[PDB]
Amino acid sequence: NTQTVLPFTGLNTPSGVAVDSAGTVYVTDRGNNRVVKLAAGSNTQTVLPFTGLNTPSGVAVDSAGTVYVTDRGNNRVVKLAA
């Protein structure tokens, strides 16, 4: 009977979420053309250094911490190693 709002900042219509084995939460912040992440316990998000994103629609993270993003408005899929 408890839900928790995560302390992300300045999201605009977030489109997708993933979480890695360390508990870091990754979010496609669609309306801001960026991907943000928040480590478990952390109070401050960091912005992943993707470039040229256009309304990213979704995100996945693998066992190696590689982050995959559907860059919807650019008809492509990008990834970034940890």
Question: Site residues (CB under 8 A) for a copy of itself?
Answer: 1-6, 8, 11-19, 21, 23, 25, 27-28, 30, 49-51, 57-64, 66, 68-73, 75-81
Residue among 44 and 64 whose Cβ is closer to a copy of itself: 64
Q: Are 9 and 51 in contact (CB under 8 A)?
A: no
Task: Work out how close the CB of 31 gets to a copy of itself at its nearest, in angstroms, rounded to a whole number.
Answer: 8
Task: Work out how close the CB of 33 gets to a copy of itself at its nearest, in angstroms, rounded to a whole number.
Answer: 13
Task: Work out how close the CB of 68 gets to a copy of itself at its nearest, in angstroms, rounded to a whole number.
Answer: 5
Instruction: List all residues 6 or more positions away from 8 whose beta carbon is below 8 Å from its beta carbon.
Output: 14, 27, 29, 36, 38, 45
Whose tokens are 């470039």? That residue is 51
Whose tokens are 């839900």? That residue is 3
